[PDB]
Amino acid sequence: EVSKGNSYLNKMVSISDITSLYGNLLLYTCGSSTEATRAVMRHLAMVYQHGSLQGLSVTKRPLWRQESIQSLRNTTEQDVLKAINVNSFVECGINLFSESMSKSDLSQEFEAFFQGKSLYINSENIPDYLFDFFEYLPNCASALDFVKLDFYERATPPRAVSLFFNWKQEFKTLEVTLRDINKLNKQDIKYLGKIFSSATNLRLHIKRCAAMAGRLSSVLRTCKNMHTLMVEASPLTTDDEQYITSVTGLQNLSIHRLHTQQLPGGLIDSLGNLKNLERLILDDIRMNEEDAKNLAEGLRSLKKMRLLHLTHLSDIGEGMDYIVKSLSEESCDLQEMKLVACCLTANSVK
Amino acid sequence: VLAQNLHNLIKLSILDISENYLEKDGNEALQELIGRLGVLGELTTLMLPWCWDVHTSLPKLLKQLEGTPGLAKLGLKNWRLRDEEIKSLGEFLEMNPLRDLQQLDLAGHCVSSDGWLYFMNVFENLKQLVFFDFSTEEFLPDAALVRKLSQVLSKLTLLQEVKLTGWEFDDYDISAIKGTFKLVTA
């Protein structure tokens, strides 16, 4: 009879159905029974559909039509979209955890259920229900990979940290997107610091933050590890390059709004410090060919790199030839090389 | 003089000279102690002589720390120690199978909150510690340490109270998670 009840779960496909009468149904199954909802948790493992992707987009959370820090982590504009409801699952899950009052009993399941997934929050739309899961099982938060936060208007986030006071160190990767800030209260940078100490890796995209100038210093001093930095539509001088170089832990690095050629002592020759960069994407950068050669000097230390893209580089001349020279100078572990929309010669291909 | 008759003073569980500046070569007192450990083991606790630049006497002290077991309390009190040193002593402490001690009395050393940050990497596994006070004579204003403390605090067990003797800092919104035990600003 129970399996007959179970066969009623052969009727239902993932959280998906939150749009219709069976979405909530497992909730109703659970308010109804205790231990038995472990059987419910079994179908939660039988979910391969990832919910449904219709009406949802990895570019709805930040509210942008333009590159993010998350975008620096990837070669396309989208990807989370494919498995967009990975955290949609989690909201259902906190409710489900709550419904049979399922304590530590249903925990092996939930560590496994939200695994391979990432949650992303905007500061403008911060739910109250996230500290809810943290009833009996705040630790299983580390089944998830990254909890992502976008902070706009003002640096003022005491409400955000309160969450990371409740959870055990350390999150693997923790990422933050900064929007329309004209109030960079160097005091509230620190709250972001509290958020930042939760993670081994921290990723930041600073976007439309007119209050953000040399003040990125405050952003970094509090960083355990600036794992990835992307900067667009915000105040930028060449010196901030050094903050990029202070962190040897850097895996991914983009800046797509220089529009200015990089100096002699530029960041291009501090690749000798970022040995861990597995991915570099430079888009629409104005540069000196000789500087590109200097960039070339950097690639010997970039053998640990899986990806190199240099695109929409103007004023690059034969510097790209040189970069290619650096490529063929020595072996690399590179898995990806993009030479598109730079000045290429048949010789460079040779 | 204490040293000369100390084998008769073996009767003592307590010979206390701590919180004392000796006139000259105070830290060099410790070499006399290495000679006296056969009877210094009979003390129930550690009392160290201190002076200006006393911390430079720590390697001398290390032969003495194989004697950490009949220790009721442990300190490098009023030792004006390198900020790094606290994790360093911690490394010996990693190599040290002793467990359970009741109080770690470090009277204000020169170690900073950042120093303490290194130290958290050792403090978690000393969760068997009953009491503790961490002093410094001019503490850094940052509560980033208390946060790291929170990382350590899940890790700690038999602790009854946290003691903050001398730290002139605010704990900020971190004081929400300041401890799972009692707290005194001193």
Swiss-Prot record, chain B:
It is found in: Cytoplasm, Cytosol; Inflammasome. LRR repeats lie at residues 10-32, 40-64, 73-95, 98-125, 127-147, 161-183. Disruption phenotype: Mice show defects in inflammasome function in response to S.typhimurium (Salmonella) infection. Differences are however observed depending on the strain background: in a C57BL/6J strain background, no striking differences are observed compared to wild-type mice following Salmonella infection. While in a BALB/c strain background, mice are highly susceptible to orogastric but not intraperitoneal infection with Salmonella: enhanced lethality is preceded by impaired expression of endothelial adhesion molecules, lower neutrophil recruitment and poor intestinal pathogen clearance. Expressed by intestinal mononuclear phagocytes. It comes from the Eukaryota. Phosphorylation is essential for NLRC4 inflammasome function to promote caspase-1 activation and pyroptosis. Homooligomer; homooligomerizes following activation of Naip proteins by pathogenic proteins such as S.typhimurium (Salmonella) flagellin or PrgJ. Component of the NLRC4 inflammasome, at least composed of NLRC4, caspase-1 (CASP1) and some NAIP protein (Naip, Naip2 or Naip5). Interacts with Naip5 and Naip6; following Naip5 and Naip6 engagement by Salmonella flagellin. Interacts with Naip2; following Naip2 engagement by Salmonella PrgJ. The inflammasome is a huge complex that contains multiple copies of NLRC4 and a single Naip protein chain. In an autoinhibited form the C-terminal leucine-rich repeat (LRR) domain is positioned to sterically occlude one side of the NBD domain and consequently sequester NLRC4 in a monomeric state. An ADP-mediated interaction between the NBD and the WHD also contributes to the autoinhibition. Key component of inflammasomes that indirectly senses specific proteins from pathogenic bacteria and fungi and responds by assembling an inflammasome complex that promotes caspase-1 activation, cytokine production and macrophage pyroptosis. The NLRC4 inflammasome is activated as part of the innate immune response to a range of intracellular bacteria. This is NLR family CARD domain-containing protein 4. It comes from Mus musculus (Mouse). The lineage of its organism: Eukaryota, Metazoa, Chordata, Craniata, Vertebrata. The gene is Nlrc4. The chain holds residues 839 to 1024 of 1024 of the full protein.
